[PDB]
Structure formats: C-alpha cells, structure tokens
C-alpha cells in the first residue's frame, strides 16, 4: 500500500489538474454562450407588440400592467430590462399573443 500510496497520490495529482484547466475552459466558453443567449431572446419583439403602460410589480420578475386596450393584466417580465426604469407608470410594450413586458 505504502508504495502504491505514493504512486496513487501521483495519479491523483495530474488527473486532478486536468479538471483544473477544464473548469477554466468551461467558464470561458460559458461567457460566450451567455452572450449568445442574450441576443437570441431579441426575436420576441419584432416591433408590432402593443403600446401599454407599466402599473405595478408584485414581486421579482412579475408585475401588473394596464394596457391601452382598456383592460388590465397580470404579467411576467424579461430579465434583460433594467429595474431602474420603473416608477410612475412608464410607457411599456407588450406581446400581442403573450402580453408580457418585453
């Protein structure tokens, strides 16, 4: 065991290090993949959405908006929007079908 201890710890060194470089690889690739992720969400708008108005938010990433269609709704939001743009019922856009704050 004792000589095989000293050999097996050696084997536990490099095989452990390749993982060290590996997580570097994964992280750097994920930085790219996330930025590819943000752009592909952009297809949701395509322009003809609706002009509505933000009203209020219940909690994280979900709020209430009263559309210019006369009615009021309960909706979710995109994670891309900056939360500093809120307050005093801002002009907002919404999906035709989904009717989500985009």
């Amino acid at each position: 065991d004792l000589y095989s201890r000293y050999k097996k710890l050696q084997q536990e060194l490099e095989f452990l290090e390749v993982q060290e470089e590996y997580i570097k690889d994964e992280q750097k690739n994920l930085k790219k993949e996330f930025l590819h992720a943000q752009e592909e969400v952009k297809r949701i708008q395509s322009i003809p959405l609706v002009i509505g108005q933000f009203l209020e938010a219940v909690d994280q990433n979900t709020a209430i908006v009263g559309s210019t269609t006369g009615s009021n709704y309960y909706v979710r939001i995109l994670s891309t929007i900056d939360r500093e743009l809120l307050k005093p019922n801002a002009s907002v856009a919404l999906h035709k079908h989904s009717n989500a704050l985009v």
């Binding site: 004792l2 997580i23 994920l30 996330f34």
Partner: protein
Amino acid sequence: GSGLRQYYLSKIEELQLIVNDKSQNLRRLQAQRNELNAKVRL
C-alpha cells in the same frame, strides 16, 4: 521504517496535501460553473 519506510512515508506527505487543497479549489470552480449553467439555461 526510518531508513527505508520514512523516505516514502514522508514523501506521500505533499502528494496528499496537494490533492487535499486542490479539491477545495476544484469544488469552488464547480460551484461557479454550475452558477453559469443555471443562468444561461434559464
């Protein structure tokens, strides 16, 4: 022991210490990577 064993018993010292630390580091990196996986998946 002292002449024959101690050279390997004392040399598995750092072979054990290094894998001792790089597992802490490894799991740190694992936690970060899983953070990224959850984020970009959502």
